[PDB]
């Protein structure tokens, strides 16, 4: 835990298709 | 250049703005309620409320009536800016508490 | 026969008036209220006086060697393959009848269904009188929709009036959402206090880990169930404080909230929806058929006729009764009224 | 003006199927009364239909 | 009003006669055809 | 009143925000960051791989419920969408089994997959960037053994139970390198999918794509995400003696305690309180206690199905809300 | 890289694979059982996991 | 009725028109007829149309009006304990319309310490939203549960409960919105008075506003029945026993 | 028939709890309530999914047609 | 029993009164043009338009509505005889017409 997973990874699913 | 997302309902619009209904497709109570709250947090806004006219349609009708200081479009744009800022503050605080833990 | 629906007894969304129910989408998505229909069709390859019998020859193809659409799920024997979907218009028994019972007139068994079915059993056998017997079982998985009928063991039936997303449903402190919302106006006039006692008994039962009893002139005592509810942290009367799903605010009334046994009744709007524009007419009367299976029309009876007369709608009378049922352009002699 | 205008509006319009309307008006409330005689408890009157 | 299923609206039709006022609409309905709901199922020509 | 939801014996009061200009003559509570920024606060209570519990403090119900709704219904996750049955001779129907496999939550992180475009042809809709392909090949046979007659089926047969862990990740295309370090497995591998007797077999492949919990429950990433207002118990007058112990019994174990020496009942931990308002039915404590809930203190509990961490789910929800506000802002308004 | 997709009879008594000839009989060859079931088709069936 | 095409397999009707049909959504089925000629279509919608038949011909009393949950929602809004700030009031008015109606917000009933609107003001805006609305309604009505004032000489609106509805210029000056003033069988109905003074279109507009408002308001306010609602108090046990 | 994968109401995965609940009841015999709480089924909807499930698949498998 | 006997009296009376309609000279007649009532109810009034107690106008509500709709504090109240003068200016032409 205590990890900023969202900063580390460049999201793709979250953007609208 | 999305030309279908948010529409201005002209039959519900006044002269010189300050009172307008916007139709926002692919929206529901999630954005409607937060937007209404933020918009009511504006001194010039005298009236704000949304409605999903029918569950079958993914459509949201948000009504803004202001006093004469600003137009409904300006109050809407300010509401969206303020919602973005609020979510940014939430993001910063939450990521900081995650890092600290 | 039923499922223990998480029920919140509250007025909600306005689609739950006069016994209509509010069903939780994503309870339905997870399998709440899911059911299947299984229907049988029986054919006999009968035998004939001229040493002849019916056959199940078929599965013809087009130029490529590809089966035609009506035979898409048929299989070489001419009996619909087990596991395959059959749509409206497709053949699953390819019955050919002799033209002189050599030549075989086609009498295929067509699937005429609004919704597709699946073939799960094809049984080939002979009857006691020596002749082949074919039975094909068609299964149709059904998902609950608007107009499907549910009941709660207390005579409080009602159709599904709206299916709402889980986030729109009210939630308690633990995030539990109702699977069904039962309107509170169905209680005061019907006076089913046993339904409320059942909600409390079932709630205390799940919390305690035990199935409870509602035996006539007995059952689990209400005060003992209240003791269980309080010991588990809940209000004794079964009323939890809920949050609105659409606003997030606490509802100003405490909501009677807990498990209730619900039955999905056989009456499903999928089997009731019927619409006729033009179709078969009776050979005698030339009027639309009387059967929903025969694409029949909806009768406009003497009482509806009385209503339309009371409105004074003469042209509507003509249109409904003569023009759109049986209008005949006859030739009438003006000398003899014949 | 209001009273006179409403009085004028009240007049039965020609063409009205007033007989059929009266038939349904006398036969609709009848579709909610018991075929067998039920009486309030304690009335103890004559058994009148 | 009454809400009518699109499934029964696709079978329950109204026989609209083409005028100079609705010709474009009726052409669009014909193009949509019997399956897309704002469509049409039958055409009766003037002289047939 | 004044930010406190009133918990009465027959009703709930003061549930609306009342923090806007036009509530009162002092047109205060205008929106501004640097007031909300300095008053808002987050207190995280716990963190797991599958559950988080944190306090959004000094935020409005509309925003908190927006995050909750986004988590439940709008945060994307990956689940099986299409099941192709090569062979299914079990008693469980094909569509029933397919629905169950859809309800199996996959441990594939989204943002590794792209959204499927459904405008494309069927032959051109699924790619190595859009889809996870899971196979399942089980054949049940009698155990070539001889234990006690009519024993449990785990040793009378082989492969008598089909678990979710039997679903095998099949890399397609370039997924063999993309997913080499994070092979796709069920989040819950002991999920019982089907039971089969000797001679029965289940052979299938399943295509798994990104989805939205509003589209189907199987796509929801949270086994429940919700909040609750912070309970508040105000003991108006001292409670002492056995009456204090009865008052203590009116609440869950740890909520209130009895001070040693003073023998007065004090509120020990209101968070552990469930608002059953048991105390509000005795007429002995009728004026000695006020129950309430802080209207802008939200105790979020976010338990994830398993594909992603609960804090990630919450951050994605905040980002989704911000993104939809920004998309609306950028969109032009059409007459 | 894209993608594509992804007369046997059973006696109801002894569960034996049978092949019905052209106009022979409708009985099991192992036992005498007179009820035969079509085995599941070989082709693919696609279901939406909903 | 005017057809409205919708996705599911049921005929749907607004609940206000359940009374004339005597329909109750427990598996009830109804028949739909499409007139096929222009003459029949015009006759149907002009003589048998819903707005033209808000009254029964047997007595002239309204028959299309608020049904159960609509009545209860109206009662809970107009209940004397209902107060609303500007935000809640405008959200209620947006629910009442589709968000496409202009509302002239009246001065709040309570101006200090807070700006609060009563529920009767909400329903006054339901009757007459803005100054362009022609509906100016005047009405006196006895609610179905009317206890008289404490003194035999006081006017009826001094009822000890909200037992008496005074409406002046579309403003509800007392009394809750009950069945007797929003339902069937009474000619002092709000919708009946709107009908008689301004026409079926405005009567139906007000009824549509009420239906949409209640359908959205009751779910978010909360209204539930429980075992405690039918549990007798401990004193009544002993009283009824000895009695 | 077979235990649902998810609680109908919350959506929690309960399909991996059926065998372990059966084992907790049979071996090291406990009460149904304590067995349910030991599996993390705290919400009463989740408790219902296991407590009320009827395992009809085991009866349906006695009629195996491919013995 | 009620569902069995629903629409019995309705049908019977429908056969009795089915052909009666109001005529353009305010008479109710059979299809054989025979007079049943020389005027409907002896009044000519439609029961669908009665706002009183089977009387066409609700005087109290109508008076309150008129007072509210024409109200103006900057207006002069007529003397008690002048109210009757205005009333008798309106009524009396219509009274002598008959
Ligand atoms: Mg009914
Ligand atoms: Zn002749
Ligand atoms: Zn055999
Ligand atoms: Zn659950």
Short mmCIF file of N, CA and C in Angstrom, two decimals, chain F residues 4-127:
data_model
loop_
_atom_site.label_atom_id
_atom_site.label_comp_id
_atom_site.label_asym_id
_atom_site.label_seq_id
_atom_site.Cartn_x
_atom_site.Cartn_y
_atom_site.Cartn_z
N UNK F 4 -25.24 19.34 11.41
CA UNK F 4 -25.49 18.08 12.08
C UNK F 4 -26.85 17.57 11.64
N UNK F 5 -26.87 16.36 11.07
CA UNK F 5 -28.12 15.68 10.76
C UNK F 5 -28.73 15.22 12.08
N UNK F 6 -29.99 15.60 12.31
CA UNK F 6 -30.64 15.25 13.56
C UNK F 6 -31.29 13.88 13.47
N UNK F 7 -30.94 13.01 14.41
CA UNK F 7 -31.49 11.67 14.47
C UNK F 7 -32.56 11.68 15.55
N UNK F 8 -33.82 11.74 15.15
CA UNK F 8 -34.93 11.71 16.08
C UNK F 8 -35.51 10.30 16.15
N UNK F 9 -36.47 10.13 17.06
CA UNK F 9 -37.06 8.81 17.25
C UNK F 9 -37.95 8.41 16.09
N UNK F 10 -38.51 9.37 15.36
CA UNK F 10 -39.42 9.05 14.28
C UNK F 10 -39.04 9.67 12.94
N UNK F 11 -37.91 10.37 12.85
CA UNK F 11 -37.58 11.06 11.62
C UNK F 11 -36.11 11.43 11.62
N UNK F 12 -35.66 11.91 10.47
CA UNK F 12 -34.31 12.42 10.27
C UNK F 12 -34.44 13.86 9.81
N UNK F 13 -33.67 14.75 10.40
CA UNK F 13 -33.81 16.17 10.16
C UNK F 13 -32.50 16.79 9.69
N UNK F 14 -32.63 17.94 9.03
CA UNK F 14 -31.50 18.79 8.69
C UNK F 14 -30.50 18.07 7.78
N UNK F 15 -31.02 17.49 6.71
CA UNK F 15 -30.23 16.65 5.82
C UNK F 15 -29.68 17.39 4.62
N UNK F 16 -30.07 18.64 4.41
CA UNK F 16 -29.62 19.41 3.26
C UNK F 16 -28.50 20.36 3.65
N UNK F 17 -27.68 20.71 2.66
CA UNK F 17 -26.38 21.32 2.92
C UNK F 17 -26.49 22.70 3.56
N UNK F 18 -27.27 23.59 2.97
CA UNK F 18 -27.43 24.97 3.45
C UNK F 18 -26.09 25.70 3.58
N UNK F 19 -25.21 25.52 2.59
CA UNK F 19 -23.91 26.20 2.58
C UNK F 19 -23.71 26.96 1.27
N UNK F 20 -24.68 27.79 0.92
CA UNK F 20 -24.65 28.57 -0.30
C UNK F 20 -25.10 29.99 -0.03
N UNK F 21 -24.68 30.95 -0.86
CA UNK F 21 -25.19 32.32 -0.71
C UNK F 21 -26.63 32.40 -1.20
N UNK F 22 -27.49 32.98 -0.39
CA UNK F 22 -28.91 32.90 -0.62
C UNK F 22 -29.61 31.99 0.35
N UNK F 23 -28.85 31.35 1.25
CA UNK F 23 -29.45 30.72 2.41
C UNK F 23 -29.87 31.75 3.44
N UNK F 24 -29.09 32.81 3.61
CA UNK F 24 -29.33 33.79 4.65
C UNK F 24 -28.94 35.16 4.11
N UNK F 25 -29.21 36.19 4.91
CA UNK F 25 -28.94 37.56 4.47
C UNK F 25 -27.45 37.78 4.24
N UNK F 26 -26.60 37.20 5.08
CA UNK F 26 -25.17 37.20 4.81
C UNK F 26 -24.91 36.23 3.67
N UNK F 27 -24.76 36.76 2.46
CA UNK F 27 -24.57 35.87 1.32
C UNK F 27 -23.19 35.26 1.40
N UNK F 28 -22.95 34.46 2.43
CA UNK F 28 -21.68 33.80 2.65
C UNK F 28 -21.68 32.43 2.00
N UNK F 29 -20.58 31.70 2.16
CA UNK F 29 -20.38 30.39 1.54
C UNK F 29 -20.42 30.47 0.02
N UNK F 30 -19.94 31.57 -0.55
CA UNK F 30 -19.62 31.55 -1.97
C UNK F 30 -18.54 30.51 -2.22
N UNK F 31 -18.55 29.92 -3.41
CA UNK F 31 -17.49 28.99 -3.73
C UNK F 31 -16.16 29.72 -3.82
N UNK F 32 -15.12 29.10 -3.27
CA UNK F 32 -13.75 29.49 -3.56
C UNK F 32 -12.82 28.41 -3.05
N UNK F 33 -11.89 28.00 -3.90
CA UNK F 33 -10.74 27.22 -3.47
C UNK F 33 -9.94 28.13 -2.55
N UNK F 34 -9.03 27.55 -1.77
CA UNK F 34 -8.24 28.23 -0.75
C UNK F 34 -9.09 28.53 0.48
N UNK F 35 -10.39 28.28 0.39
CA UNK F 35 -11.23 28.08 1.56
C UNK F 35 -11.64 26.62 1.67
N UNK F 36 -12.18 26.07 0.58
CA UNK F 36 -12.41 24.64 0.51
C UNK F 36 -11.10 23.86 0.57
N UNK F 37 -10.04 24.40 -0.04
CA UNK F 37 -8.77 23.69 -0.01
C UNK F 37 -8.21 23.60 1.40
N UNK F 38 -8.37 24.65 2.19
CA UNK F 38 -7.84 24.62 3.55
C UNK F 38 -8.77 23.93 4.54
N UNK F 39 -10.07 23.87 4.25
CA UNK F 39 -10.98 23.18 5.16
C UNK F 39 -11.12 21.70 4.85
N UNK F 40 -11.03 21.30 3.59
CA UNK F 40 -11.14 19.90 3.23
C UNK F 40 -9.98 19.11 3.81
N UNK F 41 -10.25 17.86 4.17
CA UNK F 41 -9.26 17.02 4.82
C UNK F 41 -9.57 15.56 4.53
N UNK F 42 -8.52 14.75 4.43
CA UNK F 42 -8.65 13.31 4.25
C UNK F 42 -7.93 12.61 5.39
N UNK F 43 -8.63 11.69 6.05
CA UNK F 43 -8.05 10.85 7.09
C UNK F 43 -8.24 9.40 6.66
N UNK F 44 -7.15 8.74 6.29
CA UNK F 44 -7.21 7.33 5.91
C UNK F 44 -7.11 6.48 7.17
N UNK F 45 -8.04 5.54 7.31
CA UNK F 45 -8.06 4.65 8.47
C UNK F 45 -7.34 3.34 8.20
N UNK F 46 -7.54 2.74 7.03
CA UNK F 46 -6.94 1.45 6.75
C UNK F 46 -6.74 1.30 5.25
N UNK F 47 -5.84 0.39 4.89
CA UNK F 47 -5.56 0.09 3.49
C UNK F 47 -5.19 -1.37 3.36
N UNK F 48 -5.84 -2.05 2.42
CA UNK F 48 -5.51 -3.44 2.10
C UNK F 48 -5.22 -3.52 0.62
N UNK F 49 -5.14 -4.74 0.09
CA UNK F 49 -5.17 -4.91 -1.35
C UNK F 49 -6.60 -4.89 -1.87
N UNK F 50 -7.59 -5.06 -1.00
CA UNK F 50 -8.97 -5.21 -1.42
C UNK F 50 -9.95 -4.32 -0.68
N UNK F 51 -9.51 -3.56 0.32
CA UNK F 51 -10.43 -2.71 1.06
C UNK F 51 -9.70 -1.46 1.53
N UNK F 52 -10.39 -0.33 1.49
CA UNK F 52 -9.89 0.92 2.03
C UNK F 52 -11.00 1.57 2.84
N UNK F 53 -10.60 2.38 3.80
CA UNK F 53 -11.55 3.07 4.67
C UNK F 53 -10.95 4.42 5.00
N UNK F 54 -11.57 5.48 4.49
CA UNK F 54 -11.02 6.82 4.62
C UNK F 54 -12.15 7.80 4.87
N UNK F 55 -11.79 8.95 5.41
CA UNK F 55 -12.74 9.99 5.78
C UNK F 55 -12.51 11.20 4.89
N UNK F 56 -13.44 11.45 3.98
CA UNK F 56 -13.53 12.74 3.31
C UNK F 56 -14.24 13.69 4.26
N UNK F 57 -13.51 14.66 4.78
CA UNK F 57 -14.04 15.57 5.78
C UNK F 57 -14.22 16.94 5.16
N UNK F 58 -15.35 17.58 5.47
CA UNK F 58 -15.64 18.96 5.05
C UNK F 58 -15.83 19.05 3.53
N UNK F 59 -16.64 18.14 3.00
CA UNK F 59 -16.99 18.11 1.59
C UNK F 59 -18.50 17.94 1.52
N UNK F 60 -19.08 18.31 0.38
CA UNK F 60 -20.53 18.26 0.28
C UNK F 60 -21.01 16.88 -0.14
N UNK F 61 -22.27 16.61 0.20
CA UNK F 61 -22.88 15.32 -0.09
C UNK F 61 -22.92 15.06 -1.59
N UNK F 62 -23.16 16.09 -2.39
CA UNK F 62 -23.24 15.89 -3.83
C UNK F 62 -21.92 15.39 -4.39
N UNK F 63 -20.80 15.95 -3.93
CA UNK F 63 -19.50 15.51 -4.42
C UNK F 63 -19.16 14.12 -3.89
N UNK F 64 -19.41 13.87 -2.60
CA UNK F 64 -19.13 12.54 -2.07
C UNK F 64 -19.95 11.48 -2.77
N UNK F 65 -21.23 11.76 -3.00
CA UNK F 65 -22.08 10.79 -3.68
C UNK F 65 -21.72 10.69 -5.15
N UNK F 66 -21.19 11.75 -5.75
CA UNK F 66 -20.69 11.66 -7.12
C UNK F 66 -19.53 10.68 -7.20
N UNK F 67 -18.59 10.77 -6.26
CA UNK F 67 -17.49 9.80 -6.23
C UNK F 67 -18.01 8.39 -6.02
N UNK F 68 -18.95 8.21 -5.09
CA UNK F 68 -19.49 6.89 -4.82
C UNK F 68 -20.17 6.30 -6.06
N UNK F 69 -20.99 7.12 -6.73
CA UNK F 69 -21.69 6.66 -7.92
C UNK F 69 -20.71 6.33 -9.04
N UNK F 70 -19.68 7.15 -9.22
CA UNK F 70 -18.69 6.88 -10.25
C UNK F 70 -17.98 5.56 -9.98
N UNK F 71 -17.58 5.34 -8.73
CA UNK F 71 -16.92 4.08 -8.39
C UNK F 71 -17.82 2.90 -8.71
N UNK F 72 -19.07 2.95 -8.27
CA UNK F 72 -19.97 1.81 -8.46
C UNK F 72 -20.22 1.55 -9.94
N UNK F 73 -20.50 2.61 -10.71
CA UNK F 73 -21.09 2.43 -12.03
C UNK F 73 -20.23 2.90 -13.20
N UNK F 74 -19.27 3.80 -13.00
CA UNK F 74 -18.60 4.41 -14.14
C UNK F 74 -17.11 4.14 -14.24
N UNK F 75 -16.46 3.65 -13.19
CA UNK F 75 -15.05 3.26 -13.29
C UNK F 75 -14.96 1.98 -14.10
N UNK F 76 -14.17 1.94 -15.17
CA UNK F 76 -14.11 0.74 -15.99
C UNK F 76 -13.30 -0.38 -15.35
N UNK F 77 -13.74 -1.61 -15.61
CA UNK F 77 -12.96 -2.79 -15.26
C UNK F 77 -13.12 -3.80 -16.39
N UNK F 78 -12.44 -4.93 -16.27
CA UNK F 78 -12.37 -5.94 -17.31
C UNK F 78 -13.15 -7.16 -16.85
N UNK F 79 -14.03 -7.65 -17.72
CA UNK F 79 -14.77 -8.87 -17.44
C UNK F 79 -15.06 -9.57 -18.75
N UNK F 80 -15.30 -10.87 -18.66
CA UNK F 80 -15.62 -11.66 -19.84
C UNK F 80 -16.93 -11.19 -20.44
N UNK F 81 -16.95 -11.03 -21.76
CA UNK F 81 -18.14 -10.57 -22.45
C UNK F 81 -18.75 -11.61 -23.36
N UNK F 82 -17.93 -12.36 -24.09
CA UNK F 82 -18.40 -13.37 -25.02
C UNK F 82 -17.74 -14.69 -24.69
N UNK F 83 -18.55 -15.74 -24.60
CA UNK F 83 -18.09 -17.08 -24.31
C UNK F 83 -18.43 -17.96 -25.50
N UNK F 84 -17.42 -18.63 -26.04
CA UNK F 84 -17.59 -19.52 -27.18
C UNK F 84 -17.46 -20.94 -26.67
N UNK F 85 -18.51 -21.73 -26.85
CA UNK F 85 -18.58 -23.07 -26.29
C UNK F 85 -18.23 -24.08 -27.36
N UNK F 86 -17.05 -24.68 -27.25
CA UNK F 86 -16.72 -25.78 -28.13
C UNK F 86 -17.46 -27.04 -27.71
N UNK F 87 -17.53 -27.29 -26.41
CA UNK F 87 -18.21 -28.47 -25.90
C UNK F 87 -18.67 -28.18 -24.49
N UNK F 88 -19.93 -28.49 -24.20
CA UNK F 88 -20.48 -28.30 -22.86
C UNK F 88 -21.48 -29.42 -22.61
N UNK F 89 -21.03 -30.49 -21.96
CA UNK F 89 -21.88 -31.62 -21.65
C UNK F 89 -22.24 -31.70 -20.17
N UNK F 90 -22.07 -30.62 -19.43
CA UNK F 90 -22.49 -30.58 -18.04
C UNK F 90 -23.98 -30.29 -17.93
N UNK F 91 -24.50 -30.42 -16.71
CA UNK F 91 -25.90 -30.11 -16.45
C UNK F 91 -26.15 -28.61 -16.46
N UNK F 92 -25.12 -27.80 -16.21
CA UNK F 92 -25.30 -26.35 -16.22
C UNK F 92 -25.46 -25.87 -17.66
N UNK F 93 -26.54 -25.14 -17.91
CA UNK F 93 -26.81 -24.64 -19.25
C UNK F 93 -25.68 -23.73 -19.72
N UNK F 94 -25.58 -23.61 -21.04
CA UNK F 94 -24.51 -22.82 -21.64
C UNK F 94 -24.60 -21.35 -21.25
N UNK F 95 -25.79 -20.77 -21.30
CA UNK F 95 -25.91 -19.35 -20.99
C UNK F 95 -25.74 -19.10 -19.50
N UNK F 96 -26.19 -20.04 -18.66
CA UNK F 96 -25.97 -19.93 -17.22
C UNK F 96 -24.48 -19.92 -16.93
N UNK F 97 -23.75 -20.86 -17.54
CA UNK F 97 -22.31 -20.93 -17.35
C UNK F 97 -21.62 -19.68 -17.89
N UNK F 98 -22.07 -19.18 -19.03
CA UNK F 98 -21.48 -17.97 -19.61
C UNK F 98 -21.70 -16.77 -18.71
N UNK F 99 -22.89 -16.64 -18.13
CA UNK F 99 -23.17 -15.57 -17.19
C UNK F 99 -22.29 -15.67 -15.96
N UNK F 100 -22.10 -16.89 -15.44
CA UNK F 100 -21.22 -17.08 -14.29
C UNK F 100 -19.79 -16.67 -14.62
N UNK F 101 -19.29 -17.08 -15.79
CA UNK F 101 -17.94 -16.71 -16.20
C UNK F 101 -17.82 -15.21 -16.35
N UNK F 102 -18.87 -14.56 -16.85
CA UNK F 102 -18.88 -13.11 -16.89
C UNK F 102 -18.78 -12.50 -15.51
N UNK F 103 -19.43 -13.13 -14.52
CA UNK F 103 -19.38 -12.61 -13.16
C UNK F 103 -18.06 -12.90 -12.46
N UNK F 104 -17.22 -13.78 -13.00
CA UNK F 104 -15.88 -13.98 -12.46
C UNK F 104 -15.05 -12.71 -12.64
N UNK F 105 -14.52 -12.11 -11.57
CA UNK F 105 -13.73 -10.88 -11.71
C UNK F 105 -12.28 -11.19 -12.03
N UNK F 106 -11.77 -10.59 -13.10
CA UNK F 106 -10.42 -10.89 -13.57
C UNK F 106 -9.41 -9.95 -12.93
N UNK F 107 -8.24 -10.50 -12.61
CA UNK F 107 -7.13 -9.70 -12.10
C UNK F 107 -6.27 -9.21 -13.26
N UNK F 108 -6.89 -8.43 -14.14
CA UNK F 108 -6.19 -7.69 -15.18
C UNK F 108 -6.42 -6.22 -14.93
N UNK F 109 -5.37 -5.50 -14.82
CA UNK F 109 -5.49 -4.07 -14.59
C UNK F 109 -5.99 -3.38 -15.84
N UNK F 110 -7.06 -2.60 -15.77
CA UNK F 110 -7.41 -1.75 -16.91
C UNK F 110 -6.28 -0.78 -17.18
N UNK F 111 -6.39 -0.05 -18.28
CA UNK F 111 -5.32 0.76 -18.85
C UNK F 111 -4.22 -0.10 -19.45
N UNK F 112 -4.31 -1.42 -19.31
CA UNK F 112 -3.56 -2.34 -20.15
C UNK F 112 -4.32 -2.68 -21.42
N UNK F 113 -5.63 -2.50 -21.41
CA UNK F 113 -6.49 -2.75 -22.55
C UNK F 113 -7.09 -1.44 -23.03
N UNK F 114 -7.36 -1.38 -24.33
CA UNK F 114 -8.08 -0.26 -24.92
C UNK F 114 -9.55 -0.63 -25.03
N UNK F 115 -10.40 0.39 -25.03
CA UNK F 115 -11.82 0.18 -25.24
C UNK F 115 -12.08 -0.41 -26.61
N UNK F 116 -12.98 -1.38 -26.66
CA UNK F 116 -13.39 -2.00 -27.91
C UNK F 116 -14.29 -1.03 -28.67
N UNK F 117 -14.03 -0.87 -29.96
CA UNK F 117 -14.91 -0.11 -30.83
C UNK F 117 -15.93 -1.06 -31.43
N UNK F 118 -17.21 -0.86 -31.10
CA UNK F 118 -18.28 -1.73 -31.57
C UNK F 118 -18.83 -1.30 -32.92
N UNK F 119 -18.29 -0.24 -33.52
CA UNK F 119 -18.65 0.11 -34.88
C UNK F 119 -17.91 -0.71 -35.92
N UNK F 120 -16.86 -1.41 -35.52
CA UNK F 120 -16.06 -2.22 -36.43
C UNK F 120 -16.75 -3.54 -36.74
N UNK F 121 -16.34 -4.22 -37.81
CA UNK F 121 -16.90 -5.54 -38.10
C UNK F 121 -16.59 -6.54 -36.99
N UNK F 122 -17.34 -7.64 -37.00
CA UNK F 122 -17.11 -8.68 -36.01
C UNK F 122 -15.73 -9.32 -36.19
N UNK F 123 -15.28 -9.46 -37.43
CA UNK F 123 -13.94 -9.98 -37.70
C UNK F 123 -12.84 -9.00 -37.33
N UNK F 124 -13.19 -7.73 -37.07
CA UNK F 124 -12.21 -6.68 -36.87
C UNK F 124 -12.47 -5.90 -35.58
N UNK F 125 -13.22 -6.48 -34.65
CA UNK F 125 -13.54 -5.78 -33.42
C UNK F 125 -12.59 -6.08 -32.28
N UNK F 126 -12.05 -7.29 -32.20
CA UNK F 126 -11.23 -7.73 -31.08
C UNK F 126 -9.78 -7.83 -31.52
N UNK F 127 -8.89 -7.23 -30.75
CA UNK F 127 -7.48 -7.16 -31.06
C UNK F 127 -6.68 -7.63 -29.85
#
